[PDB]
Amino acid sequence: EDAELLVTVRGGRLRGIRLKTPGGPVSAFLGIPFAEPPMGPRRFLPPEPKQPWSGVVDATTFQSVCYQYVDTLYPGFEGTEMWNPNRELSEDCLYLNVWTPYPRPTSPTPVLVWIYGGGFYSGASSLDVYDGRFLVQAERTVLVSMNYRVGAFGFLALPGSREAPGNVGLLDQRLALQWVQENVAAFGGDPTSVTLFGESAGAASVGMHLLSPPSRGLFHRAVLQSGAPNGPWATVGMGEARRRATQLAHLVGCPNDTELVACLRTRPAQVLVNHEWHVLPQESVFRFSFVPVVDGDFLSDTPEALINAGDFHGLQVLVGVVKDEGSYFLVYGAPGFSKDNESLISRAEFLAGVRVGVPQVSDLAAEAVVLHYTDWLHPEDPARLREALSDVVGDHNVVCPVAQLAGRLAAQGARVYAYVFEHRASTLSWPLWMGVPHGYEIEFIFGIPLDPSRNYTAEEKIFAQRLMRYWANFARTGDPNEPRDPQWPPYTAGAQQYVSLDLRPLEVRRGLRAQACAFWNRFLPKLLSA
Amino acid sequence: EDAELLVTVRGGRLRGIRLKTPGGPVSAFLGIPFAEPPMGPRRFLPPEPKQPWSGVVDATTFQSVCYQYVDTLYPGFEGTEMWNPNRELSEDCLYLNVWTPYPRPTSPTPVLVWIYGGGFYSGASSLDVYDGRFLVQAERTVLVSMNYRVGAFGFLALPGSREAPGNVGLLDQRLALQWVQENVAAFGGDPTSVTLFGESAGAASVGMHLLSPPSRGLFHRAVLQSGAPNGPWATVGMGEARRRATQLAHLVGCPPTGGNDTELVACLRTRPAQVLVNHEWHVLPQESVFRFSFVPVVDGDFLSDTPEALINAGDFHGLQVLVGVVKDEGSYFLVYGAPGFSKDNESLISRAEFLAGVRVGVPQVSDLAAEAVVLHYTDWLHPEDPARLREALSDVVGDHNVVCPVAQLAGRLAAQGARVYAYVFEHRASTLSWPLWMGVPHGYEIEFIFGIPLDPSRNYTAEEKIFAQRLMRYWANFARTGDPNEPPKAPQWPPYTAGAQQYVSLDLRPLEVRRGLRAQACAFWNRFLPKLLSA
Ligand SMILES: *[C@@H]1O[C@H](CO[C@@H]2O[C@@H](C)[C@@H](O)[C@@H](O)[C@@H]2O)[C@@H](O[C@@H]2O[C@H](CO)[C@@H](O)[C@H](O)[C@H]2NC(C)=O)[C@H](O)[C@H]1NC(C)=O
């Protein structure tokens, strides 16, 4: 019996499992319950701490995936399947995972906490691409990831009601962060050095914890990869949340908030999932039905407001984007797009594409998008229209919200590091026209290229090793830099410096699409207010 | 008596003068009356045709400059004085000039008609820079130029009223063109080949003649240099013109505000010309640049609709047009009103001076509109760089007032049947006295088009003399054939079209072909901004 795989936490005793990497073993504790199962009367309610157990919890395998919609746009295709649930779906899904060096560290090790993305409607901590073994072995951190409720289960809100208050998936995350404070020491972790990191909705989540005081006490540094709490998709107001909750009830045949939630509770989970997409008010890309709601509670104001009025002295943040943030989303709703052709759209498709990509704005607002994003010397050229519409969607949803966050944070006391990730994985199965799509930096941050049984090049392995070193340096010190030799300077609102991450050494550049983001961040809001 | 210097026109007999030019003699008939003097009771009224006379009128020197404001921002400075009146001011100013080859052409010769600019408030055909002797000598065309009333005398309007209907300066121009039809043959000119050309307000006037059918019969081709009838400075609506007329009258004590139009006008008629002139600048609604008090008025008469609407709805088959701009359209205007600007320093403005300059440069738009301008003209990697800010303000003013209106005109004329040629004039004259930062300012191609560098007393380089010869050639080729190209191995000037948008650079190097008249910038001014102003 291996004593390194026995741990006792506040609720009871756990048995882990030893895992192999090419660098040596690692200890993992997978499927640790951190909340009571949010089932039956508990659906839509905030999570309750897991009651203590007798005996030994088997923590040797990933637990169930939270109920969520499963992608079937390209059945069997690696590019979609790698994001899909790889364990059975269940509402009993509130488990977290801890990876630690082997043998377990005997002194306080810095903790990385991963929050997965997936539009707040999908994702799982068990996905291969989020495997913590390589980071833990190579950089000697403790790594934690949790499942949190997604879709209606995590974000359906009838604001004001006690039966469906909203933001419960965010409370799932907070609760797991509380669990880490109380229990990570038992694994060698140091509860006083917890770095949060997340991608997409995960990054939006990280930012939300930054802006919510009951969460802010539970971690020390933050990494936001291709996502921001101020993204136009990342939150909804109370009115639109109520409307969507109400449209979901009617689609599944339910009728007073109390009677409405009670009827929703009688419905099989899969039935709610089968109607995921149907509650959005208009045809769109990069929009998700059930997202965090601004109701004065978890967020006391909009993240934009909270960001502008925050003092961020004492915070270090790492943020960044991939080279082609918009491309992936176009195959899921823009007319004329497919992974299976060059998606060389027409001017008319570009224009209908803009209405989809910037949903719910006035025609004047759309015209201003079209103006900014048309090359008026080549207004009708298919390849430029494809790149331009990718830019529209990527800038609006990701790049410019991230730039805004970085600018405000740096100007209000935080030390910010920014990157653009510009390497297209040799193993990437999405077409070449998609460039470096959303999500495709992650396998490199987790050092997945070190897995022998996969097809990455020798250069790609070395690259993954650089990136794990940046991320872990940042977790340990608040600064990604290695000792002097090409340096990664902090991002400031004036100089606006960021680095390109690819196979070549660090290259410093200026401005996160400064001209485009001026439009989205400075001009467009004024237009929308008049 | 010299038979060449004697000519009979419908009105009576004329005696002209024989001018020396470095390439040979030219016959000039300067100061031909074409209207009854718009004096006294005829102030603000449409021009009356000149009554026949007995005997011989001496057309031997330029007549008076029409009453106008005189610039004193830099007294004695060559750059300003070259534009100022060089004859005495008078309301008695409706004279035109004809230059013809000596000996007089035997067969009918194509005619160029010049229309000066100066914001509809200033200018004269007598200026040295508009001397037609060199064009006529080099290219054997007939050149005509006319005076027309400017300022309140030309464009004060109380719309609807008989006593000050507005647009009489444009009617002055039209009467001159009728005179050309009736009389230019007597000088050896061809009334069936008449090409108008003008710069700034003159270019805008040319465009208005295109858009107004009774004018349209009087010429065949048009050249618009750095101006367009659709420019935001070039017309006002009836209400704004009335407001301005009324504030002028009020500033000079008429009536002893508003009232009977007949009475208001009669009171204005008793004021000395100079009294009106002194208050001219004072009626503009806000502090501004590139704005002028009394300009053509859209009243349904001369212009049946806005020039914008007429350009859009018009059929321009059978028409050739040549249009263009200088390299730095906006710079000149900035020293006449934008904070931080001077000809006597580098005008390296602050960001705050830039924002304030935007309000002045784009007057009478919403705050949101101004914000859109700041967004499109700020470099967000260098938002406070003084040199860049100076340049960008120059571009705001140049694009908004000149480049974008001309591009829109060119695109619409091309799309709708006209052969269009477009240019950008990029040579900065060796003799230019304005500071280096202004680059190639508004108005500084004219001296080259008119061949002024051939004038021995002036100190242009030999290359500039060659350049001027090339330019005169294109203009004359265009006037003769509707096509500036040489009827060889010489680089070709391609038509401008709404899709390819090709134009040429004019300078010391040969023709270089380029695409887009500030196409990105102009999409903002011509496509987006108007939609924003509506909403
Ligand atoms: C590129 O493909 C899109 C999408 O098409 C799907 O995948 C293709 C490879 C092929 O199997 C199509 O038949 C599929 O629909 C094409 O867009 C579609 O055009 C059809 C009509 O021709 C229309 O009914 C669909 O709605 C369109 N799909 C979308 C997403 O708008 C597009 O034309 C292809 N581009 C080419 C051929 O250049």
Ligand SMILES: *[C@@H]1O[C@H](CO[C@@H]2O[C@@H](C)[C@@H](O)[C@@H](O)[C@@H]2O)[C@@H](O[C@@H]2O[C@H](CO)[C@@H](O)[C@H](O)[C@H]2NC(C)=O)[C@H](O)[C@H]1NC(C)=O
């Ligand atoms: C550039 O000049 C302008 C305008 O000024 C004139 O010419 C200068 C060469 C110098 O002799 C000035 O004193 C002249 O007035 C400067 O702007 C002016 O500043 C004065 C007071 O200093 C103020 O009353 C005026 O309103 C300003 N004029 C404006 C705003 O148009 C400008 O500061 C000069 N730039 C420099 C010195 O860098």
Ligand SMILES: COc1cc(-c2cc3c(c(=O)o2)C[C@]2(O)[C@@]4(C)C(=O)C=CC(C)(C)[C@]4(O)CC[C@@]2(C)O3)cc(OC)c1OC
């Ligand atoms: C099939 O039905 C539909 C599916 C989608 C749909 C699916 C979708 C996304 C998206 O934006 O829209 C983005 C996405 O979620 C990612 C790209 C994402 O957001 C972030 C990260 C990863 C994991 C890479 C992802 O979840 C991977 C899975 C993705 C592509 O799946 C949209 C629809 O409306 C147009 C729709 O029909 C109404």
Ligand SMILES: COc1cc(-c2cc3c(c(=O)o2)C[C@]2(O)[C@@]4(C)C(=O)C=CC(C)(C)[C@]4(O)CC[C@@]2(C)O3)cc(OC)c1OC
């Ligand atoms: C001194 O009083 C003022 C004068 C002006 C003023 C003067 C002026 C112009 C102009 O845009 O505004 C442009 C101008 O006319 C030209 C550049 C032009 O338009 C076209 C061609 C030429 C001949 C070169 C010009 O007429 C030459 C004379 C110019 C420079 O003179 C503006 C004022 O308001 C800010 C003002 O104060 C109320």
Ligand SMILES: *[C@@H]1O[C@H](CO)[C@@H](O)[C@H](O)[C@H]1NC(C)=O
């Ligand atoms: C203005 O006054 C004159 C008298 O001097 C008169 O003949 C004319 O009809 C009046 N017009 C109007 C509109 O009152």
